[PDB]
Amino acid sequence: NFINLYTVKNPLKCKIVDKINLVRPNSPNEVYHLEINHNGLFKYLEGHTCGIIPYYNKKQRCARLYSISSSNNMENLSVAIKIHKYETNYGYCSGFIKNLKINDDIYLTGAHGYFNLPNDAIQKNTNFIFIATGTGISPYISFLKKLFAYDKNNLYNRYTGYITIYYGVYNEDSILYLNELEYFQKMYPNNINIHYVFSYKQNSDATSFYVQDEIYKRKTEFLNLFNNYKCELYICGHKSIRYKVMDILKKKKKRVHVEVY
């Protein structure tokens, strides 16, 4: 419907309005939120990704997909980008965003992906299970901005479905869009619930424990949400979540959605 409005053959010249560090000092990561002005020319649905072409102006135009973390009604679009480090050396797109200044040009490729809300969403009050690791919160934040009618400039005013979020990051300081997730939690406590799976460990020095085996730990009530409440299931993050959750479940497959990277 909005797919390939802009390609590498014709990218859309956009402006950076703001660049915000999504994490806090006790995070080992560095991730940036970008506010991006596109003059309303960039078209996407909630949960679409966009491509950014680093250093678009030598013959090396190489796009990287990023999940849009804003709603359609918001004039500017939001994106959330992990900066990758090795040795300090940076990833190709990662270093481009590291050096991005306010009001720099950024060149975007048109809507990508099918990781979208069903068209009936606010009407039929459809229940949702969202599963995320790291930057994979981005498409779910976009969903929540649509459903809960989010406005940063109108937060004191006013869908009745039930949303269970299973989110996996390192620690408290590594929860991306923490302000928003707390706001939805505070304003809608009978409509939203968030299970945080932290991958650091303090008291115990135990095994590995991720978002999948937290879902496995309470596998009955999770299957109850999917069966009794007719939930749309969403998986976004690392590929290991796919099989471990899908084998808990094993015609009704159209309710499951996956975008792994």
Ligand X SMILES: Cc1cc2nc3c(=O)[nH]c(=O)nc-3n(C[C@H](O)[C@H](O)[C@H](O)COP(=O)(O)OP(=O)(O)OC[C@H]3O[C@@H](n4cnc5c(N)ncnc54)[C@H](O)[C@@H]3O)c2cc1C
Q: Is 91 in the site for ligand X (CB under 6 A)?
A: yes
Place of tokens 């923490």: 178
Q: Compute the distance between CA of residue 198 and CA of residue 161 in angstroms, rounded to an integer.
A: 26
Q: Is 260 in the site for its own copies (CB under 8 A)?
A: yes
Q: Is 247 in the site for its own copies (CB under 8 A)?
A: yes
> Contact with Na ion (CB under 5 A): which of 133, 164, 174, 212?
133
β-partners of residue 81 are 32
Distances in Å between the Cα of 169 and the Cα atoms of 105, 118, 166, 172 are: 31, 27, 10, 8
The tokens for 155 are: 């937060």
Q: Is 133 in the site for ligand X (CB under 6 A)?
A: no
Task: Give the per-residue contact string, 71-110, with its own copies (x = CB under 8 A; - = no).
Answer: ---------------xx-----------------------
Provide the minimum distance between the beta carbon of 197 and ligand X in the complex, in angstroms, as a whole number.
19
Q: Is 180 in the site for its own copies (CB under 8 A)?
A: no
Q: DSSP letters of 102-154?
A: TT-EEEEEEEE------TTHHHHT--EEEEEEGGGGHHHHHHHHHHTT--SS-
End-to-end Cα spacing for the chain = 23
* Ramachandran class of 23: left when φ > 0, alpha when ψ lies in -120 to 50, beta otherwise: beta
Provide the minimum distance between the beta carbon of 204 and ligand A2P in the complex, in angstroms, as a whole number.
14
Provide the minimum distance between the beta carbon of 159 and its own copies in the complex, in angstroms, as a whole number.
28
Task: Give the per-residue contact string, 28-67, with its own copies (x = CB under 8 A; - = no).
Answer: x-----------------------------xxxxxx----
Residue 139 or residue 168: which is nearer to ligand A2P going by CB? 168
The tokens for 20 are: 């915000």
Residue 46 or residue 225: which is nearer to ligand X going by CB? 46
Q: Is 210 in the site for its own copies (CB under 8 A)?
A: yes
Look at strands 49-52 and 31-37 and give their pairing.
unpaired
If we measure between CA atoms, which residue out of 91, 76, 62, 251 comes closest to residue 152?
76
Provide the minimum distance between the beta carbon of 122 and Na ion in the complex, in angstroms, as a whole number.
28
The tokens for 89 are: 């050396």
- The residue type found at 14 is C
Provide the minimum distance between the beta carbon of 162 and ligand X in the complex, in angstroms, as a whole number.
25
Residue numbers at the binding site for ligand X (CB under 6 A) = 49, 64-67, 80-82, 84, 86, 91-94, 112-113, 135, 138, 259, 261
What is the contact surface with its own copies in residues (CB under 8 A)?
8-9, 28, 58-63, 86-87, 199, 204-205, 207-210, 212-213, 216, 240, 243, 247, 258-260
Q: Where does this chain bind Na ion (CB under 5 A)? A: 133-134, 237
